[PDB]
Amino acid sequence: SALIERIDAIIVDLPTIQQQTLVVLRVRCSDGVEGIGEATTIGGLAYGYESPEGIKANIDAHLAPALIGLAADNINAAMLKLDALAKGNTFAKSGIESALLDAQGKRLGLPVSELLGGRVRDSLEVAWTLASGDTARDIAEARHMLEIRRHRVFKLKIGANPVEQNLKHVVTIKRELGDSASVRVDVNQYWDESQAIRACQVLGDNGIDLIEQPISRINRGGQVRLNQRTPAPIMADESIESVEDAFSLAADGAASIFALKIAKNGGPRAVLRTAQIAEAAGIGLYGGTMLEGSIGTLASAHAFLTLRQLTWGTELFGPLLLTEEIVNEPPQYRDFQLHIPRTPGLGLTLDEARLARFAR
Amino acid sequence: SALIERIDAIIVDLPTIQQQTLVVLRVRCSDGVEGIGEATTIGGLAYGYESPEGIKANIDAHLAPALIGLAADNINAAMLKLDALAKGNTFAKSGIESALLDAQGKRLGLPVSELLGGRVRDSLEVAWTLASGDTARDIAEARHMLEIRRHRVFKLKIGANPVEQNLKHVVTIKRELGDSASVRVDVNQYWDESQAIRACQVLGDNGIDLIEQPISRINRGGQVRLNQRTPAPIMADESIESVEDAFSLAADGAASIFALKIAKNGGPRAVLRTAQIAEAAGIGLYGGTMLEGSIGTLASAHAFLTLRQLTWGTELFGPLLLTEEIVNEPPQYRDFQLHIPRTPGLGLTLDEARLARFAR
């Protein structure tokens, strides 16, 4: 019955704790109900082929036009249509599926986690990226985050400095924190196998719990090798740019952990398809992020809530990086977790004034 | 909101065109809504480790008790719980998930296909197993089924007679029918690789469209080999006894086609998990059956309706084999297809009198 009448893709720049750009989606349905979503990336084109500009451009010019007039309640049909009409564009697709799921949740008065099957938990463990680039600074922030019971899992973004420097930094931090916190790294494809061979060993020998995307996705055999040789488990993130990529990697034994990002898969339903594959292969899960705001973070969270298990938790800390939001409901972070309300849809409403404010 | 108050597993023997036993499930919810499902097999234990007797025994003694008091609306949590409490028992689990999905569909007034994402079609191509055991009779039945436009896809159950005899039979039928019908075989694991090597070639060289489960699931390498050497595509059925089996087979390249049976996977949601994996690997789909009645057939159909594509259609002909049904709504078979109503749930209601009649 309800139809998709219009979809708006709005580029919004928000201040952080330094701007963060999100593409807010608003799908208006003939039944008066409106869903909101979010297609967010990091650094224009540096973390994916989809920039905020390219995202809005294609939604406006291609994806949205293909949906107007379609049943808002038939998300599958809509999303399958988007797949027949467009190659990739998972970020843009993710924002749209998120909005459609939100709209469908308010319409049925069910939270998205329920639309997606039913939550098995009401909160998710949330990791925190220590980014000060200063070891002492990072250890202080870690101790602080532990103090206020906000985070007990920390990840270090490395690979940008000499291998030995990052190794020192990361091992110093773990050394200092001990068993009071879990320490992980994310090399974001910065190392080549020859560099990863030694670093991975050192990290694993010094209490690092997991090594996220050490080398580039272009070296598949190296991932398979490190998944066999690293003392510390290897997690695939950038290597997954789609659900089929997830199967490919699982079939190869390229990672014992898969990071789950709706943006890299195509939305909440798409990320569960990847998760489903991981569970079938026996691969461990992790709730990933592209540093989304509450909308994208909640879209992710609602999906992760249905997961039987997330051995390595999540890094759904995106909203805490922003000093301003475009939704009224502030994220609920208490005791190392993100608490998700049972309210319908994503449980979020737009802060119209701020939207107008930061919309570029 | 609504809770699972009581689940009934009823063994029903129905006359066929020779009895057919189904285990009818009735899950009654605290909100007055009741869902019906079906856990059906063929021949006691000859086609699966789950017999009608074992199915009712375990639902009563284990599965059902674990669900009473649980939210009827949180199907994922319920089914995940059944997985934590019981190994296998996909048939029993399938009947229960089917009933839960039915009950949830009436409660929200949405057809199960929609609960499952949204249908991309309203009917499914239906194949017909020619069973007369007589070549001439089978060819007659084929032409008859073509005439009344009920079936244009036929499968022959072989492997029970000498290889040459079945080969002759099957090739004679295809030759006689020409391009007016698609002819497939299902050897039900009856051949060993050494027998399949020649038969598969002959069948493929004589217009047989696909070869369903030629050899036993115990010979994995043989399946991988035949998937590489058969002139006719190899479809995996019995080899899949779970979603993880589907991943295993896909990772191996053991079949270019996967038959989808909710019974062998654990229900409508479980069969879609397997289908999702097949789609990710690029494996072709087929809607399979354990010869369910309208309930199981409709539970399957509602899931298959959301599938982007089913290259080889379905064999959802189960209800046409029975001369009596325990539901009021007769299956809609017209023009080589099974038509699925948009009505809520499975769109079926129990024929109380007949239920009482055939319930053993």
Added chain:
Amino acid sequence: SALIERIDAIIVDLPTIQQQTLVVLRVRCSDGVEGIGEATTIGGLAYGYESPEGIKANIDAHLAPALIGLAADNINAAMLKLDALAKGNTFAKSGIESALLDAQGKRLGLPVSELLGGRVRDSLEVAWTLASGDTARDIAEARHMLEIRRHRVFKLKIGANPVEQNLKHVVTIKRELGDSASVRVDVNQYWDESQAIRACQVLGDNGIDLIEQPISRINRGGQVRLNQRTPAPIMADESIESVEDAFSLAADGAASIFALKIAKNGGPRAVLRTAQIAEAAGIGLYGGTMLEGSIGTLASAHAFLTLRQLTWGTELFGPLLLTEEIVNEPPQYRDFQLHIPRTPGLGLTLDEARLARFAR
């Protein structure tokens, strides 16, 4: 000459040191001889798809009817028939083959180990699962078991608590016991490869002799990987759900040790088929248990007696867990071993009164 006249499957709940349920089998032969067997599992459906209820249901409804009138002396023909009529149901099949072997042993006045070829030993090393869940408690029990010379091999059931907690627990116990006892673990599929990677290393680096089923049977490649990378040998248990599973695993190099459980294979003859395959591949053996009572334990033992070698002994401690038995002859545990009499059959007779007592 002698025929199978009737088979009784009796569900018996016995008190333990907390109930333990066994399905006692009684096969009555036309020659007056009667054999007894046992189909026992742990926790209904939590350790196998076969529950006590499902076991009795299928024996009564399917397996037994197929055997009445058949030659009691032709166990092969009978068991092969059960395989043609039923998929899986190894537990139920195991109880029946055990009873048939017992009956055939009394009839020929030969112990089952002899029927099975001939014993090469008269006793088996028996391991003991320390289960108190309390480290200090477990170390005390270990020291005690060593004292009375009952056990010098101990296994810890882990995987239910955080990896670090179980690691600590297990390493603390080994540390404390030193070279006076062998310490093994059984994770019962509780870990996912990403968790097993580090735990296995730690365990192997701290004197743990072997790691039983660290990850789930759904992750085959992970087993192959850990069988290559674990400092401590990997043993397959739950991964084997049949003799063909054993071949599959051996062909893959998924474990350097196979646990031998008649229940998971289909009986004493079936477990030897698996053992035979293991010996051919060079895979090490272990006498496994589903915590059977004296009947199932003796059925297992009689088979394990014919084994050339059992590098890691057995865990045939099932009877010591029960405070009551349904057989008259008490198990012979002395000097870290289970001593098997040369008496005919299993060397056991039913304690009719107790049978009637605990039969549910």
Added chain:
Amino acid sequence: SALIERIDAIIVDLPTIQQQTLVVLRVRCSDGVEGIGEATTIGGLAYGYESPEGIKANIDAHLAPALIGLAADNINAAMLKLDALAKGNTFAKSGIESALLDAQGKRLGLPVSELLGGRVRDSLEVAWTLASGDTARDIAEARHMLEIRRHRVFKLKIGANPVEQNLKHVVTIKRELGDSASVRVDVNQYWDESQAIRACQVLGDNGIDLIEQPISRINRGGQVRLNQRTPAPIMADESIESVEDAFSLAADGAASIFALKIAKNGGPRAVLRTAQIAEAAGIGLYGGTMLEGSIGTLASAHAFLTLRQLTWGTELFGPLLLTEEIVNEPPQYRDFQLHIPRTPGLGLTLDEARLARFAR
């Protein structure tokens, strides 16, 4: 109870339809019972490393001495002992296990097939090697054998003449016989992969049912390749020189059919170990022969009788090649089969006079 008191290995040369040498074994037990066996090969050392001379030499000097005093009833222990004391020597071991099984069968009054588990059939299909070396003669012999209903399955020993000549010969014979008989070849390792590539295709394209050992056992990859490319199934014979060889081949996918020869495995129990492995891998079976007399043929037959299935029958025609036998009971060949009596042991007794006659 009964012990092995003395074992005699007697070399006997028998006239054929041209001599055939067998090593007759006589194991005398302390209980008065005596078992007879046979260790027979073809051509001294040309078909195995074990010649009649080497066989008697080692039994006398090594195997037999190790058994005197041992329990005649504990065959497993005895045979396992022979394995600990001697590498290979399967022929010699086979004659001894055969004799032990015979002696144990008379002692218990059970036929060997029963000692081995229980027969599932009373006769076996018997193939016939057409050896005239003349196409026309061979076709005549084939029609004759069909007429008297003695054989309907024929094999041609090829590989000794140019590939084309043998191809012509073999294809001419099949063409001439049509579907009235099954035609197979045995190249006895005579071809190298480069020759087999074309021949196998031609043979398979001209109705040859299977290709026995086309190339040498030294080329493992070639066997794996031909098992993948031959239009006609590949059977392994010479490649199997032990049970572990059988596992190796099955693990490799080197043949879809395994020939079963007790001589190449180590006796009736050993051949069943190989058969069990084949059944587990899904490999097809065939009862092979080294052209044994009634003793070796019956030892084989009693084992093959317990086999669930032998897709390609047997070639147990050995006794029909001899014009004189050293046993009193003449083999029962009627209607394409060898009929096995239910009598105890092998059902054979020595023809003392003839034994003394032909014993070299």
